[PDB]
Amino acid sequence: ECTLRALVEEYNGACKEAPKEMSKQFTDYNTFKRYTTSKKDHAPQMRLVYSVRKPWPISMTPSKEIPLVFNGTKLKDTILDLGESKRTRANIVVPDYWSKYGSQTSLEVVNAILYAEDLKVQRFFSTEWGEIRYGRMLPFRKPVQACPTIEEVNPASIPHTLLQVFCPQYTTLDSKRKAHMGAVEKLKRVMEPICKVQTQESAVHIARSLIDSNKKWLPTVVDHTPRTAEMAHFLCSKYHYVHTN
Amino acid sequence: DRPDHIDSRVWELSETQEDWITQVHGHVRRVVECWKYTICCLISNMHTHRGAPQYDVFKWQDRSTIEWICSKKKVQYPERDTPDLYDNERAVAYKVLLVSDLSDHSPTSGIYHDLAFNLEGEAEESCALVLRGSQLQDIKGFLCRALEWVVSNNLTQEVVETISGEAKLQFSVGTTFRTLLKRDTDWDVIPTPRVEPNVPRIEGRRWTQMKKLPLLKEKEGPPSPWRALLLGADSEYIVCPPGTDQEAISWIHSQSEIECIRESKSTPASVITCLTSSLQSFAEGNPVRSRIHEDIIAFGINKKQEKKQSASSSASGEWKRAEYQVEEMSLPPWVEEEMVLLRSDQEDNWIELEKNAIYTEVDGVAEGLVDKYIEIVGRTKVASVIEKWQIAATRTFSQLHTDRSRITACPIITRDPSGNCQFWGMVLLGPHHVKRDTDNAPLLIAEIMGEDTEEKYPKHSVFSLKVEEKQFLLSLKITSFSRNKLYTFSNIRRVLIQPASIYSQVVLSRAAENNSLNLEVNPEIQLYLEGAQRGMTLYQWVRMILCLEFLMAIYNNPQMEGFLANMRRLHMSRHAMMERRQVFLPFGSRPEDKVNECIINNPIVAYLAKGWNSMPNVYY
Amino acid sequence: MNLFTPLSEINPTTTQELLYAYTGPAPVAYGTRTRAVLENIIRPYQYFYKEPNVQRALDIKTGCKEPEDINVEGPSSGFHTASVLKLADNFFRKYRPAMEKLKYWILVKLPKLKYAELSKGRQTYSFIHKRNLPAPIALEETVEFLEQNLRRKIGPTLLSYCQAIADVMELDETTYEGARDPRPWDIQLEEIDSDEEDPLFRQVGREETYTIKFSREELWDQMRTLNTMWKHLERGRLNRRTIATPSMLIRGFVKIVEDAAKEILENVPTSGVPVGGEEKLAKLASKQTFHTAVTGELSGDQEKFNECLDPDAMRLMWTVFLRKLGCPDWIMELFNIPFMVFKSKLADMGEGLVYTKGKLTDRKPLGEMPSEFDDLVRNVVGNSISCRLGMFMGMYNLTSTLLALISIEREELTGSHVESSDDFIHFFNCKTHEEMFKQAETLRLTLKLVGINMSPSKCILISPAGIGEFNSKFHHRDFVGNVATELPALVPNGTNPMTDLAMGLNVIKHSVNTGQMNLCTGALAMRIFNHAYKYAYMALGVTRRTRFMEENAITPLLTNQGASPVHSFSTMHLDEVALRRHLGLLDEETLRRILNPNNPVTQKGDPSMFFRIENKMPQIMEDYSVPSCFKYTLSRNRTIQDKPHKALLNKEERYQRVTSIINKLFPEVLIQEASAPGTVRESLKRRLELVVERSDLDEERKKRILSRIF
RNA sequence: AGAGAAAUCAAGGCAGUU
RNA sequence: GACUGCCUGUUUUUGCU
Ligand SMILES: Nc1nc2c(ncn2[C@@H]2O[C@H](COP(=O)(O)CP(=O)(O)OP(=O)(O)O)[C@@H](O)[C@H]2O)c(=O)[nH]1
Questions:
Q1: Which of A150, B432, B489, C391 could form a disulfide with B441 if both were Cys (CB 3.0 to 4.6 A apart)?
Q2: Cα(A202)–Cα(C619) distance, rounded to whole angstroms?
Q3: What range does the record give for the signal peptide (chain A)?
């Protein structure tokens, strides 16, 4: 396979160009995965308007599918971005150009990246709402599971359950025990199209979304089921309550 | 620091297997683990079975490769009791257990058959049977070297302690760091004060009841001039023929005459040429023009250098500390008339917000309340001023390249439902290189006026504008405005939310008590107007609320923030007294002193303070 | 203001929303912070004695004072040692489950805390660059400093990092030997990965080596040094405050104590500092079992909180707690280092007091010429000044709340108390008004015992309970929402249109869920946010994006593209893309094209993102928006050029390459933390061998693949 | 000038030349 | 001095808990 050859070449290049960073500790990955000089979470609201209007306002990794000039408009720069090794700048309309003239993925990948959201939308659009009744309702807060999950799993065994979904060959027998066998095959069958080494940084997030139960304080009148809690913002209030069936 | 018998390779491999430094006798434990790993290596020195080596070292190896090997060998081991090495010629896994007794066989685990040595070199009889002699002599030599190193350093108690039990966590503060620590405290690291724990009885003070609400200080001085960026209620538009911005500006520039009715020394009358040049350039098509000689005065080009040079030229001889005075000002008369004209009914809705989707009966109810609220507060002058402020701020902050060296024109043009353009004015962004949030971008705002005062607009320069047998007054002020304020005024339409919340609460509470929504409730609400109690309809009230919130927003400053923050306590105390409740205060309690320290010159703060000092102060 | 006070229909408490001006500009601080820092450091030295005497109060090391010395009619700085000891014991005797959980945290979770958790913070003062740097960079340089002056490898745990810090100060002299660009004004370009028509260049920068010499005293000062700054965009005060950041050499020590304090506080029923421990006060308000009793309600604030507190009293309270649980002495020697470094604290001054000569002004240090802070000149160390008494910043809010809570625990005080740093609320339930007055005065005096110092003009007691205030939440028979607090957060963020839309809907939904918004307010906020969203992302009127869509015939199919809104008040939890797919707005082709994994513009992220409104307490927000082509990030800021320390960019790109070779070979570092013992090179080599050997290929192919690895 | 409020902005650096 | 070009608009000592 050429993938192994590419991995070996990338390892050799990283060894050559960064001798010191390769002499670090593997446990330091938890701290240099975030090593950047950028300050983008520092008051981002107050810079948006003139940042998307600045020349070369967007960050876009070099590729051959984006022409330099399309219909007289320069879409991308020929200079790698500052502080970036595999990332350069482009024009703000590059997303718009890609939305029509870009490459296409498979129909199965779309149903995988949009799985949890699709279940949320179908859950919302498969309920016969009752009639709104008005009154001096008393909403009280109580820790309730936010959104429905595919299967009930202890929050302490979620990492050990996802490890059997993505990398079952890189785990011990203890993690094999402390995993919810029953939630691993469903996640595998719904995430196989994106279990590749390119969408594995996005599949873990959504797969965790299907399986993680986060207790959150939500207003209620009657006790929430886990399905009537993601929609509590409009089913209950201090003046109205609609009774779902 | 490495022992001589311990190889460099095993030492480097051991360096990070366990956290030696925070363990009791960590170096000794590292040396013992190196002994065990070296013993395991000597057991598997070039000895092979079939085609692969007879023993596979499972100690100090990556866990994933160990799992791979175990899968090849059809075995599985727990991580916290994993074997040390595996023998493929006898299908058993082994572990090194250097011990002292050599008599306590005591099989540690039934998963791996354990190998124990007496630390003198001899092997427990089972291990002696199950291993070949050359390995035994190799371990004999390695251990005699280990113990000569031990006796050379007097570590026998440490090594027996390590081979006895597991590691113990610890933390160590050195003698030198302790002395540095104790330089500024009378106690040591672990405080042991020689006093008997008790709670003393101290005599305090009495708590006084607030019989009457505090009276805020009405400050005295010259009335506060209007200091907002735009003109507020005294702002009008010119109904231009329908078209685009360029066509409207061309019409305005061609069909106009400019004459000075009132010139202020703050903004000279020679900066009108800048506005005319900008209008001509924007009409020609290019919204950005070069610099003219009148721009140096209208935008403060090289102002810093000339002021610095003048300050250097004229200087005192003491170098005293810097004292800054904030001039005291009284409530100007224009606040009430501003609040009145901002409530004037208009002909069209000035709040045009795209509706959201509707999917549920709840959704339609939510969009009915908002629709009715926009119907209430959209056909009102305050809505017009909010709209003009939003277009002005957005067109100045979006054209704020934030790094530019030429003058940019940003007309304030809106469209009526009939399509006719409405020219409210034009902001002129000048040479700006703002980086810090305190930096000010030069501005030159031309605005259509409704009435000149000379008491409310002292710095503005009023001009007469003649467009098609109609008379308009054009103000022209030189201002500097910061990026943060341009940002927060581009989202000025958020001021419509606080007035909306009050209306929403009233309507929804009436629906809750009536068990049904109406959407056409016009309740009477009692307020202390002109000092007396009168009942008003909540459609004028939300309008008053909206105008007051708009005036507060455009006049927000540290004085307003402090006044509002320290005044909520007094408002809550009034609410408590209205319910026939008693309010008590601590000894040195003067809650009005934190409100009175923020009343300096802000006109809206003075208006609110006067409104408070027109209310009942005792609730019998 | 008579318009904001209704007399019918709705209560004046319901109009507390109108007493906020949050849609206007937020106060911003101008100029030097040195005066506000010197006036923050001198206040603890002015409240120690009942009569102000700074000169005598400058010799106090431990702020212990006698009961008759406490100023009962003013702010009192200091504590009473015997009272602290007794109150820390009374707080231990009650709330014993909390102490058991603290012991559990000490013996289990404390040993398993990693020092990589110091990289999840924000701007940290660097003792090497003498500037504020992001937490990952400061942590990396501190570990590299400690791994070369100690000549050993620091363990992954926080205890290893603390031990390394405690061991590096034993050395007389230390070195750094860092890297910098000699000539940052010479940007050279080379051709990388492209020689085919469309070239791709990068910026190459030189990297020379420079060394900094620290003696023991200079390194000690850098450990004590607190970089100060203005607190911009603070709302609700007339005067501007200063805030400071501790160095990375003390942050681990601080984090241990703060995590233990959090473990205590999330189990004591009298603490409101934890975010989930705020809804308990709703129950305390709903507690109406009063019957013919004189039940008052006191709501107030503490004056000079970070100025009247002494680190020694807090240290003593922690020592009492640990010694009464039963703990090894190194536990009590680990929980006390933070407070003994923050007793020798060296706060950083500004650039100099403003002295004027006529019209021109010059920035000059404290020592030069007299001023109003001439008493503190003896505490000046370089451009920094020492301050034994006082905290000077709210770095310990958790343990300060703990001190207040141990002060609460007495016998005659039989009321309900909720404490959160400076702001608090207390409920009295007595038999007569005089007993309630005694309890209130006893509460005041007990807070003054340890130096909590209730503000006289900010605490208001209502004799019939029912009206109060706690952290901008007003109470009248129930807690009503306050929509005005959320208004500063309804502006779209600055990350990308998808994340901006998701976070805007999440904020509005959270506001609705807390009762701060309702049907009409939520829908109007959504409409306003949608208009701002469309304007801010080049989707209104004639703009470059709309133009490029016009000539190129690209129809708008997203809200950020100018399409009609799809989200509604019911559909706030839903994603834009899935909602549009379900209703038929994104048929199949654009969806297969914008969600393509090969998008060159999309950037991977985290469903949890930073969310601060305006210099308030940072929060966390969920971002479930799918990684479409519209989930991008802005261009990198280029101010770092023309600076000597631009070599951090080369280190950052090298670390990005090392992170890219990882996350491909190790797919288990996305689910849990990295725990493999060893270097990066060895682990990567072993995983290469493991993946190639486990793969199904010819053995000759396999060994040929292995041969290239080097 | 102005913005503004307890002190700042009203461009700042670097290279070469001079 | 200024005077020829280059660079920067959050990274300049300045958004912490
Ligand atoms: N570290 C931080 N602490 C904060 C922040 N905001 C508030 N606080 C803390 O809250 C408290 C604020 O109270 P102050 O000490 O300013 C006393 P008071 O509120 O009475 O103000 P004055 O009357 O002006 O002294 C104090 O402990 C601060 O450290 C913040 O952003 N960071």
A1: B432
A2: 23
A3: none
